[model samples]
Target: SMSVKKPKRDDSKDLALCSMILTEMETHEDAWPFLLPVNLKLVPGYKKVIKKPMDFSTIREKLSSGQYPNLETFALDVRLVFDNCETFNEDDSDIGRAGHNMRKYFEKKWTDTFK
Candidate 1:
């Protein structure tokens, strides 16, 4: 007879390293020239007009309105940060932190706003 083994899970490791890798690839020398700057301020703009401050109803409304240009611009902005992580110095902790924070901020905003 054979016995089954359960899977193990650990949360002590630094999760940010994966994000750092993405940041590194984004800022690679070859990719830097073609990368566009992401506007981190746009989320705040959406937040300002949303109900309850962080709600995404305003954003959803705008996206569905089909009356505005750059309706999906916010997504593009997020991509820019991921694509240009390597262009800056690898040691640039500030930029990495900014990208990580922006991701978290948007994630929370998206979840909170939509619900």
Candidate 2:
């Protein structure tokens, strides 16, 4: 038997799963708005309106580093991207619609893949 002083859990499986989901999202047509962080200069008052901004790029990096402990935690950050989009843009707007579309696809994948 072997004993470790720290509580380090193996996260390879979680990281691989997250990476797979992320790759699909990244290539999705609706992923445009979420591909990168919003440009504050392009959209004035964006910073003040959305307190927490999330994007696919950030999520990809987080997954690459294994920051998420589990699938749910990775899902949390992914949800944030859409939540922020909903808050910043009107539902009927192009970006907002893209967010909704991406969210739907991701959720479906989430359920089919893990649920």
Candidate 3:
């Protein structure tokens, strides 16, 4: 059993994820040149929300999310997200950990589901 934290501090990893998302968003726009900016602090995660990890399970939600109807679809989504990833550069690296964890999690999830 676990409980939620009342508060959490903002940090870089959180900031980077938001920027990646925002970059993608700003990359596509009706007023394309007018929208994107180097400093979009008004965005939520872009400004760092300072939040704790959830005690709830995201895997269950993801698997049943309808967007990823099956393991194959989920895997496709992951491949797209980490398309250029080939290595975990550092022990504490977020993208590294994310890439590694996704690999392990998907492998185990498929094995367990199929077996």
Candidate 4:
């Protein structure tokens, strides 16, 4: 069985509205296999978990028309996504692995971010 879910942790310092979903697409595409409608098979149970996979493509389209105000803003933004899912403390489940990668990418928990 899984552990109880907790509120988003305070482990991250300053990540904020830097278009998180879009950054994940660029920096951690493997963690987010599907973009628009977030295909359920790609991120199994994702819709159920997050009340439907986030409408990521819409943000991408908008962000494509724009870029980050500064690169560090994007870095802090990456931390926000992982920090929000802090309770996702698993590594084996397929979706959990995606969560794991997100954590690793932002927090550098075990390895460096590949992208």
Clashing residue pair totals per candidate (backbone < 3 A):
10, 0, 0, 0
- Per-residue lDDT for 9 in model 4? 49
> Which pairs, if any, clash in model 1?
26-83, 26-84, 26-85, 26-86, 27-84, 27-85, 27-86, 27-87, 28-86, 56-113
1 or 2, greater by TM-score: 2
TM-score of each: 0.30, 0.85, 0.30, 0.36
Q: Encode model 1's per-residue lDDT on 1-115: one tens digit a residue.
A: 2687667544233223323333443454433322342334754443333222211233334334543243135344344444344333243576555545555554554444333
**Clash list (residue pairs), candidate 4:** none
Sorted on lDDT, best first, the list reads 2, 4, 1, 3
Q: After superposition, which runs of candidate 3 have C-alpha atoms over 4 Å from their true positions?
A: 1-65, 68-70, 84-94
Displacement of residue 55 (Cα, Å) in model 1 is 22
* Candidate 2 local distance difference test against the native: 0.88
- lDDT per residue as tens, model 3, 9-114: 4442433342343243334322122232313365445234322211012222443454444345544544433332332134366645654555464456445534
The CA lDDT at 112 in model 3 is: 50
lDDT of each: 0.39, 0.88, 0.37, 0.48
Off by over 4 Å in 4: 1-29, 33-59, 87-93, 103-115
